[PDB]
Amino acid sequence: ESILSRFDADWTASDEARREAKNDLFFSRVSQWDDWLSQYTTLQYRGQFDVVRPVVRKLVSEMRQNPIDVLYRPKDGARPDAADVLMGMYRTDMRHNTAKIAVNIAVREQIEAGVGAWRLVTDYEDQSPTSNNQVIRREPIHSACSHVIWDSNSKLMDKSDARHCTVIHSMSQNGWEDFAEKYDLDADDIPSFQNPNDWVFPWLTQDTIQIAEFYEVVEKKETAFIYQDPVTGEPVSYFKRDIKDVIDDLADSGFIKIAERQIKRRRVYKSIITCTAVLKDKQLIAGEHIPIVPVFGEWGFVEDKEVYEGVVRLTKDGQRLRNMIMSFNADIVARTPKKKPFFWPEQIAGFEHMYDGNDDYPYYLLNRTDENSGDLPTQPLAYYENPEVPQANAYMLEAATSAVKEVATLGVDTEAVNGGQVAFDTVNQLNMRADLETYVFQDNLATAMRRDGEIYQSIVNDIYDVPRNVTITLEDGSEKDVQLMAEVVDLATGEKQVLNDIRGRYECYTDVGPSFQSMKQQNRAEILELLGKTPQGTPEYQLLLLQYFTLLDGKGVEMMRDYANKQLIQMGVKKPETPEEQQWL
Task: Find the shortest distance in angstroms from Cβ 439 to its own copies.
Answer: 16
Dist CA 204 CA 26 (whole Å): 19
Which residue lies nearer to its own copies by CB, 167 or 315? 315
Which residue lies nearer to its own copies by CB, 274 or 561? 561
Considering Cα of 357, then 358, then 362, then 366, what sign does the dihedral take? negative
Considering Cα of 8, then 13, then 19, then 21, what sign does the dihedral take? negative
Task: Find the shortest distance in angstroms from Cβ 433 to its own copies.
Answer: 8
Dist CA 207 CA 213 (whole Å): 19
Residue 307 touching its own copies (CB under 8 A): yes
Contact set for its own copies, span 212-231 (CB under 8 A)? 220, 222, 224-225
Dist CA 567 CA 402 (whole Å): 71
Q: Which of 233, 467, 537, 579 binds its own copies (CB under 8 A)?
A: 537
Q: Which of 164, 270, 320, 505 binds its own copies (CB under 8 A)?
A: 320
Return the closest-CA partner of residue 195 out of 178, 207, 182.
207
Task: Find the shortest distance in angstroms from Cβ 581 to its own copies.
Answer: 10
Which residue lies nearer to its own copies by CB, 12 or 228? 12
Task: Find the shortest distance in angstroms from Cβ 279 to its own copies.
Answer: 15
Residue 344 touching its own copies (CB under 8 A): no
Which residue lies nearer to its own copies by CB, 145 or 167? 145
431 exposed, middle or buried (CB, 10 Å; 0-12, 13-18, 19+)?
Answer: buried
Q: Are 137 and 103 in contact (CB under 8 A)?
A: no
Which residue lies nearer to its own copies by CB, 126 or 276? 126
Q: Interacting stretch for its own copies, rule CB under 8 A, among 175-183, 263-271, 272-280, 470-478?
A: 175-183
Which residue lies nearer to its own copies by CB, 412 or 474? 412
Residue 423 touching its own copies (CB under 8 A): yes
Which residue lies nearer to its own copies by CB, 57 or 264? 57
CA angle, residues 86, 90, 94, in degrees to nearest 5? 125
Which residue lies nearer to its own copies by CB, 341 or 463? 341
Return the closest-CA partner of residue 69 out of 436, 426, 420, 511.
511
Which residue lies nearer to its own copies by CB, 272 or 508? 508
DSSP element (H, E) containing 58: helix 54-60
Contact set for its own copies, span 441-500 (CB under 8 A)? 444-445
Q: Which of 3, 129, 459, 464 binds its own copies (CB under 8 A)?
A: 129
Q: Are 66 and 104 in contact (CB under 8 A)?
A: yes
Return the closest-CA partner of residue 69 out of 428, 512, 426, 424.
512
CB atoms within 10 A of CB 347: 6
Return the closest-CA partner of residue 112 out of 161, 60, 157.
60
Q: Are 49 and 322 in contact (CB under 8 A)?
A: yes
Contact set for its own copies, span 81-120 (CB under 8 A)? 88, 91-92, 95, 97-99, 101-102, 104-105
Task: Find the shortest distance in angstroms from Cβ 270 to its own copies.
Answer: 16
Task: Find the shortest distance in angstroms from Cβ 191 to its own copies.
Answer: 20
Residue 351 touching its own copies (CB under 8 A): no
Which residue lies nearer to its own copies by CB, 405 or 463? 405
Which residue lies nearer to its own copies by CB, 379 or 457? 379
The partner residues of 509 in beta bridges, in order of sequence, read 73
CB atoms within 10 A of CB 10: 15
The footprint of its own copies on this chain (CB under 8 A) covers a number of residues equal to: 200
Question: How big, in percent rounded to 5, are the helix, strand and coil portions of the chain?
Answer: 20, 0, 80
Task: Find the shortest distance in angstroms from Cβ 167 to its own copies.
Answer: 19
> Which alpha helices (H) appear in 49-123, and where do they start and end?
54-60, 89-92, 102-112
Residue 406 touching its own copies (CB under 8 A): yes
Q: Are 38 and 400 in contact (CB under 8 A)?
A: no
Q: Interacting stretch for its own copies, rule CB under 8 A, among 228-236, 256-264, 360-368, 459-467?
A: 360-368
Residue 259 touching its own copies (CB under 8 A): no
Who contacts 169 (Cβ-Cβ below 8 Å, separation ≥6)? 144, 211
CB atoms within 10 A of CB 144: 16
Task: Find the shortest distance in angstroms from Cβ 276 to its own copies.
Answer: 25
Residue 183 touching its own copies (CB under 8 A): yes
Dist CA 463 CA 440 (whole Å): 39
Q: Which of 5, 551, 577, 582 binds its own copies (CB under 8 A)?
A: 551
Which residue lies nearer to its own copies by CB, 137 or 191? 137
Task: Find the shortest distance in angstroms from Cβ 353 to its own copies.
Answer: 14
Task: Find the shortest distance in angstroms from Cβ 491 to its own copies.
Answer: 20
Radius of gyration of the chain (CA): 39
Residue 347 touching its own copies (CB under 8 A): yes
Q: Are 293 and 117 in contact (CB under 8 A)?
A: yes
Contact set for its own copies, span 41-80 (CB under 8 A)? 44-45, 48-51, 53-54, 57, 60, 64, 67, 75-77
Task: Find the shortest distance in angstroms from Cβ 383 to its own copies.
Answer: 8
Residue 250 touching its own copies (CB under 8 A): no
Dist CA 568 CA 561 (whole Å): 12
Contact set for its own copies, span 373-392 (CB under 8 A)? 373, 375-392
DSSP string, 39-57: SS---SS-------THHHH
Return the closest-CA partner of residue 104 out of 60, 70, 135, 136.
60
Residue 121 touching its own copies (CB under 8 A): no
Q: Are 28 and 112 in contact (CB under 8 A)?
A: yes
Which residue lies nearer to its own copies by CB, 288 or 317? 317
- For the chain, the residue count is 585
Q: Interacting stretch for its own copies, rule CB under 8 A, among 258-266, 461-469, 474-482, 544-552?
A: 544-552
Tell me the per-residue interface mask from 1 to 40 with its own copies, x by CB under 8 A, - otherwise: -----------x--xx--------x--x---xx----xx-
Dist CA 242 CA 250 (whole Å): 16
